[PDB]
Write a protein that binds this ligand. Structure first.
Ligand SMILES: O=C(CSc1nc2c(cnn2-c2ccc(F)cc2)c(=O)[nH]1)Nc1ccc(Br)cc1
Ligand SMILES: O=C(CSc1nc2c(cnn2-c2ccc(F)cc2)c(=O)[nH]1)Nc1ccc(Br)cc1
Lengths: 213, 212, 212, 212
């Protein structure tokens, strides 16, 4: 049975780079995709195929993609279950023009350890109860917001007003209502994110031992 | 201005604390006045005159204007004591170009209500014991950072990376160490800032009652 | 139209005693029952009449009376709407033996000012939209727990193990899940409770100005 | 050189039970004192010898043993730098009558891993910089007071009003002003405490890895 690590934290907490760094340090980027012992899954792969009335809100730009409802809880639960039972799985690739899933999927061969990472990884009891270990990457919201702003201006061509409109109207309230109340389910809290080498090495070491048990 | 009623106002940068003070005095028409019964004092007037070592620091972005050390606590305590005793006082006018006070001082005559506003208004016990009412304008750090970034870009012409580098290195550590722990000393907390018209009307109504 | 003030806070915040002290400082204990210009309603008077399955849970000490499910929001809504229409209204008296309402109701005549006070006074949009002013009495959970333990040994006949088991299992999670998030709806936050005479005198003076 | 783990968190966070459990799961409770590879040091062992002035405050129940000033940072620093140099060390044992150190000491032979555990283990930069790993046991203040009351009420036998007056007056203010600001120096935060078996087993394993 594969070892499931759930990782949560708000946007730009560093939950993504933490998963990236752990997997890099375990030599997994030098390993072919068919033979990887440690795989990373993101909750944002499992965005819902939107209905007519949902797609209408999304064109008007008034659909909160950080709300639990924007996420396909039942496909997440189904898929993680299959992973647990040792089965290989298909991860969707999301089209934001059509708010539907493309035909091309991503294949995920049975792994020894699976990192499942997202803003609402711990929101559903049934999904929480599949994780052997729960990690929350705790970064102050002001810190996270500065990171969000530099990232979205630099590697995307997004405008500063639009970024802070979306943050204040949608991201912040959804973080406070749905994500932050899930911090209390975490086994281990990792402050600051990917620059926290002591916490990362501690989780790398732990996965390393698992790969040799 | 027999025995002024001193109101202390704190809260982080971009909390709303200046606008709240400004709206309170506006809604009282004590705006456009010569017999001002309500005046606003700002802790921003009481910056220390800098050494040339410190002036040199300020030219680079590396002098912490959010630290207690950057404000003249002795002159603030003295100025507020004289106000409490019903005396006319001189407020400095600070020139940032020279990092020193001009000859021009602003004359504040005994008012019936004095609103003293600053990030560190409640930091010193001697100063905080002169306030008969202490207000804290409580606004979330991410909200406050959003307002600060937009003001610094759009009014003040700042570089984005410099704003946020300075935020992380100096402003945030200074707010968490020195300002945020003073919130417990507040009698009343005003969430959000200048848009809190219910909070603001409660403070204008209360100021009119003691003007009578 | 009566002026409606909603008042929330965790258990042992001091919301009850803040209300009680505001009324008494107004002189409204020396005013006659039918002539009360300012009255206090408690969300407590409006516990639901429990189902059979809820009765069962309650008798085994497994029903959370701090959950929104415990409160009769429809009756709360109805009674506040009628008070805004200037009606005389009847308030239920709850009985914890039967988990139901006594025949005895309590009569409240039209007041100028109504204080409504409860852990979940701001939980429901339609109820919170009836308040002209929302006060949240903000007292640290460790402080409030200190008060609860001393209150429950003296008043009730309870031991530490029962008070703390109940607090950890029921009061705390319900407070964090349901009460704490409503704080963002307050217009004014009152730290500490009824020893905050500056905050209390402020609400008193505001209420006096309504009565004039 | 030996591996120094610093552990902090508020009174009754569980940091002491976390250290006990880690050592119990590594089989060190069986190993002979002279051959122990993992040892727990407590900051509580390094209380300062009080001056007459402080001894005077302490007799009147006014010396705050949770204030940084109550810890002998110089002795802590010396003792940990010695452990780091491979040297055998004596740990004081304290008398809370004379507010000074007994005849008897406790000998600690060079260990491969030291857990240094206390409320202010990260307060001093010099102490904090010795630790290759910093753990902070984060337990809610209302939860910690719960445990503290039950623990203290017997283990010492003392009165309930005294435990709670002491907590509100001394412990809570000292935790909020001095301990809580040290959380940002933790590499890893362990929630709830000794019942967190995932977090405990993660640390046990890391230490086993180090001993092999
Ligand atoms: O001041 C701080 C940073 S804690 C903090 N609180 C925030 C931020 C943004 N919004 N809020 C906030 C939101 C809703 C509220 F209702 C209250 C605050 C933020 O960046 N940091 N110190 C701190 C750091 C870690 C811990 Br754990 C606790 C306090
Ligand atoms: O006590 C407080 C704020 S109010 C508060 N919140 C608490 C306490 C204990 N647990 N929580 C809590 C835990 C999880 C939640 F989701 C919500 C609440 C507490 O004593 N006070 N902090 C404080 C006060 C003064 C200073 Br100075 C610094 C920090």
């Amino acid at each position: 049975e594969p070892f499931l690590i759930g990782v949560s934290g708000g946007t730009a907490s560093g939950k993504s780079s933490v998963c990236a760094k752990i997997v890099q340090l375990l030599g997994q980027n030098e390993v072919d995709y068919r033979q990887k012992q440690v795989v990373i899954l993101s909750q944002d792969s499992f965005y819902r195929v939107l209905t007519s009335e949902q797609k209408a809100k999304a064109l008007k730009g008034q659909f909160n993609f950080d709300h639990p409802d924007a996420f396909d809880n039942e496909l997440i639960l189904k898929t993680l279950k299959e992973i647990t039972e040792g089965k290989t799985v298909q991860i969707p690739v999301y089209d934001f023009v059509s708010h539907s899933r493309k035909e091309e999927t991503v294949t995920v061969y049975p792994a020894d350890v699976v990192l499942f990472e997202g803003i609402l990884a711990f929101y559903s009891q049934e999904v929480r109860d599949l994780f052997q270990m729960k990690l929350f990457v705790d970064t102050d919201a002001d810190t996270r917001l500065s990171r969000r702003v530099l990232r979205d201006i630099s590697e995307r061509g997004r405008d500063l007003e639009q970024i802070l409109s979306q943050y204040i109207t949608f991201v912040k309230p959804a973080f406070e209502e749905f994500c932050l109340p899930t911090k209390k389910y975490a086994d281990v809290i990792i402050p600051r994110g990917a620059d926290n080498l002591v916490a990362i090495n501690l989780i790398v070491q732990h996965i390393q031992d698992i790969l040799n048990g």
